[PDB]
Amino acid sequence: HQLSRADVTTVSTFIDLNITMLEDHEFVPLEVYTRHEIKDSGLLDYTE
Amino acid sequence: VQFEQPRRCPTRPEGQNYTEGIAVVFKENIAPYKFKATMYYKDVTVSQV
Ligand code: NA
């Protein structure tokens, strides 16, 4: 007869190691209070 | 049974291509425009005693 490699049961001598890359991350600007908010927190603005 | 034949090994990434250059980073201007002035006036005081 003749056979292909797919017709034969395959066992592995290889030890698995699944390493995945760290993914690209984007940091958006973020502020708790904008400087306009901080300016506006005062009750009276002398200039205005 | 047969042993598994050698696997296709992964490839090292090409590496990010970087353009060298000079840069100037500009921000929004919040400093008021400043200049020099001169005030000419007269203090006028009328005292009723
Ligand atoms: Na073999």
Swiss-Prot record, chain B:
Glycosylation sites noted in the Swiss-Prot or TrEMBL record: 17
Q: Where in the cell is it found?
A: Virion membrane; Host cell membrane; Host endosome membrane; Host Golgi apparatus membrane
Q: What's the subunit arrangement here? A: Homotrimer; disulfide-linked. Binds to heparan sulfate proteoglycans. Interacts with gH/gL heterodimer.
What the protein does? Envelope glycoprotein that forms spikes at the surface of virion envelope. Essential for the initial attachment to heparan sulfate moieties of the host cell surface proteoglycans. Involved in fusion of viral and cellular membranes leading to virus entry into the host cell. Following initial binding to its host receptors, membrane fusion is mediated by the fusion machinery composed at least of gB and the heterodimer gH/gL. May be involved in the fusion between the virion envelope and the outer nuclear membrane during virion egress.
Q: Of which family is this protein a member? A: Belongs to the herpesviridae glycoprotein B family.
The protein depicted here goes by the name Envelope glycoprotein B
Source organism per entry reads: Human herpesvirus 2 (strain HG52) (HHV-2)
